[PDB]
């Protein structure tokens, strides 16, 4: 069912007119329409089961951004956020992306790391080699309590082991279980696997397992997007498109050079990403931590995007970053509007959701840089 994600005249429509349009285009029934149309879609009793000491609920404005097209498929994207201009800028940059075909995206697998930290070992490099020698057994043990995930094509795939010999608290060994978590965010799953393998790792190493916990630096679960714009597309009344393109690249190089700029440049990316994360019931703190920690992996805090001039003169943007979002658990299941957000987007895998999100972030970045370029 191919849709048009263009949002004609949305700036002049009332919220009820906007919802009528959305309901027609993405095929919402009347009860789904009514759920967005009236406050209180998250019943107090449901909220009271989600977190502790609930006294009520706190509303963010909820919007949709227009024109996104991801691997040739139009998608309307819900956003929950409080700051002006964000939704408009995302729409505008996705509108201008369409001449060169929208956004082209990919992902690495849905791979998450579970850390199993071992202390008290006198021969940590020997212990590391012992864990690696027993890797097949440990991977099987990790998979032993997750027959559903394995049946869906997921599960623990590999184990790596890092040694930190010189800490103020003695040598530490850290095993990482590398786990394919399919459409889940994956924390409970991998945390439980880390628990499951702990006593065997103690027997192999002679150490004491302390932390058994996912890493939020989810650098094996990357989402990527690329976009292109011509000079003709980016021309304005005051600037030739070639000048806009050069000034955007100039601004990007400033972020790639100076962490004081890169922090603002990447904040602008998250202005696009986090609202999609919130509106789907996902953990925005996890996405933030993975994004900004990844931005410093090189030894210097830098840009999560790149902007370049192609051989034919077009502007080309790219983004790549960790994107640990899911479809199956947490508030994504419990919040009635998170379920509806996923239906509006018609997403069927967590991978597709992550690629949509980073495309919005890439568009939001251009929106900021382009505006700063055209004064």
Ligand X SMILES: Nc1ncnc2c1ncn2[C@@H]1O[C@H](COP(=O)(O)OP(=O)(O)O)[C@@H](O)[C@H]1O
Backbone torsions φ then ψ of 178, nearest 5 degrees: -105, 115
**Residue 277 beta carbon to ligand X: minimum distance, rounded to whole angstroms:** 13
Q: Which of residues 169-198 bind ligand X (CB under 6 A)?
A: 181-189
Closest CA to 308 of 318, 320, 293, 295: 318
189 binds, among ligand X, ligand COA, a second copy, none (CB under 5 to 8 A by kind): ligand X
SS3 117: strand
User: CA neighbours within 13 Å on the CB side: how many for 298?
Assistant: 9
Q: Which of residues 257-296 bind ligand COA (CB under 6 A)?
A: 268, 271
142 binds, among ligand X, ligand COA, a second copy, none (CB under 5 to 8 A by kind): none
Q: To the nearest 10°, the Cα dihedral for 82, 66, 307, 277?
A: 50
Binding residue (CB under 6 A) for ligand COA from 2, 11, 169, 238: 11
* Rounded-to-integer distance, Cα 294 and Cα 21, Å: 39
**Residue 235 beta carbon to a second copy: minimum distance, rounded to whole angstroms:** 19
Q: CA angle 296-299-303, nearest 5°?
A: 40
> Which CB atom, from 149 or from 245, has the smaller least distance to ligand X?
149
Q: Which of residues 309-338 bind ligand X (CB under 6 A)?
A: 326, 328-330
Which run of H or E residues covers position 91? Answer: helix 86-97
* Rounded-to-integer distance, Cα 313 and Cα 231, Å: 7
**Residue 114 beta carbon to ligand COA: minimum distance, rounded to whole angstroms:** 14
Backbone torsions φ then ψ of 207, nearest 5 degrees: -100, -175
From 5-13, 165-173, 237-245, 337-345, give the range in contact with ligand COA by CB under 6 A.
5-13
Q: Is residue 95 part of the contact set for ligand COA (CB under 6 A)?
A: yes
Q: Is residue 360 part of the contact set for ligand COA (CB under 6 A)?
A: no
- 273-301 burial, b for 16+ CB within 10 Å, e for fewer? bbbbbbbbbbbbebbbbbbbbbbeeeeeb
Q: Which of residues 39-58 bind ligand COA (CB under 6 A)?
A: 52-53
Q: Is residue 17 part of the contact set for ligand X (CB under 6 A)?
A: no
182 binds, among a second copy, ligand X, ligand COA, none (CB under 5 to 8 A by kind): ligand X
Axis-axis angle for helices 135-143, 124-133 (nearest 10): 70
Q: Which of residues 140-159 bind ligand X (CB under 6 A)?
A: 146, 148-149, 152
From 81-89, 156-164, 220-228, 286-294, give the range in contact with ligand COA by CB under 6 A.
81-89
Backbone torsions φ then ψ of 165, nearest 5 degrees: -80, -20
95 binds, among ligand COA, ligand X, a second copy, none (CB under 5 to 8 A by kind): ligand COA
C-beta separation of 205 from 295 below 8 A: no
**Residue 328 beta carbon to ligand X: minimum distance, rounded to whole angstroms:** 5
92 binds, among a second copy, ligand X, ligand COA, none (CB under 5 to 8 A by kind): ligand COA
Count residues near ligand COA (CB under 6 A).
18
> Which CB atom, from 63 or from 295, has the smaller least distance to ligand COA?
63
Q: Give residues after which the chain gaps, C-N over 2.5 angstroms.
A: none
Task: Give me 12's structure tokens.
Answer: 């002049």
Which run of H or E residues covers position 131? Answer: helix 124-133
Backbone torsions φ then ψ of 130, nearest 5 degrees: -65, -45
79 DSSP assignment: E
367 binds, among ligand X, a second copy, ligand COA, none (CB under 5 to 8 A by kind): ligand COA
Binding residue (CB under 6 A) for ligand COA from 42, 79, 89, 161: 89
**Residue 297 beta carbon to ligand X: minimum distance, rounded to whole angstroms:** 24
**Residue 35 beta carbon to ligand X: minimum distance, rounded to whole angstroms:** 22
Q: How far is CA 261 from CA 264, 265, 295, 370, in A?
A: 5, 6, 13, 15
Residues near ligand COA (CB under 6 A) are: 7, 10-11, 52-53, 66, 85-86, 88-89, 91-92, 95, 268, 271, 367-368, 371
Binding site for ligand X (CB under 6 A): 146, 148-149, 152, 181-189, 326, 328-330
């Amino acid at each position: 069912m191919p849709i048009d994600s263009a949002l004609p005249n949305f700036r002049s429509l009332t919220p009820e007119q906007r919802l009528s349009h959305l309901a027609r285009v993405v095929g919402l029934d009347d009860a789904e329409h009514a759920l967005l149309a009236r406050p209180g879609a998250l019943p107090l009793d449901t909220a009271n089961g989600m977190i502790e000491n609930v006294i009520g609920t706190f509303e963010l404005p909820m919007a949709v951004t227009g024109y996104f097209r991801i691997n040739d498929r139009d998608v309307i994207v819900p956003m929950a956020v409080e700051e002006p201009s964000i939704v408009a800028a995302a729409s505008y940059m996705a509108k201008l992306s369409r001449a060169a075909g929208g956004f082209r995206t990919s992902s690495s697998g849905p791979l998450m790391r579970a850390q199993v930290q071992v202390v008290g070992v006198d021969d940590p490099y020997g212990a590391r080699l012992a864990i690696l020698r027993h890797a097949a057994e440990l991977i099987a043990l990790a998979n032993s309590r997750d027959k559903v995930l394995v049946g869906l094509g997921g599960g623990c795939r590999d184990i790596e082991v890092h040694v930190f010999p010189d800490t103020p608290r003695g040598a530490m060994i850290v095993a990482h279980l590398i786990v394919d978590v399919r459409d889940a965010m994956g924390a409970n799953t991998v945390n439980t696997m880390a628990e499951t393998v702990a006593t065997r790792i103690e027997a192999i190493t002679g150490g004491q397992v302390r932390l058994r916990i996912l890493s939020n630096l989810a650098d094996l679960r990357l989402a990527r997007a690329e976009v292109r714009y011509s000079a003709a597309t980016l021309a304005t009344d005051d600037y030739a498109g070639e000048a806009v393109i050069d000034r955007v690249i100039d601004a990007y190089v400033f972020a790639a050079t100076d962490p004081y700029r890169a922090a603002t440049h990447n904040k602008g990316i998250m202005n696009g990403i986090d609202p999609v994360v919130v509106a789907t019931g996902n953990d925005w703190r996890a996405v933030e931590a993975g994004a900004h920690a990844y931005a410093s992996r090189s030894g210097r805090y830098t840009s999560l995007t790149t902007w370049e001039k192609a051989a034919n003169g077009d502007l080309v943007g790219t983004i790549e970053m960790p994107m640990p979002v899911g479809l199956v658990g947490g508030a994504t299941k419990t919040h009635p509007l998170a379920r509806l957000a996923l239906k509006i987007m018609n997403v069927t895998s967590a991978q597709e959701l992550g690629e949509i999100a980073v495309a919005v972030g890439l568009a939001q970045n251009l929106g900021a840089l382009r505006a700063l370029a055209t004064e």
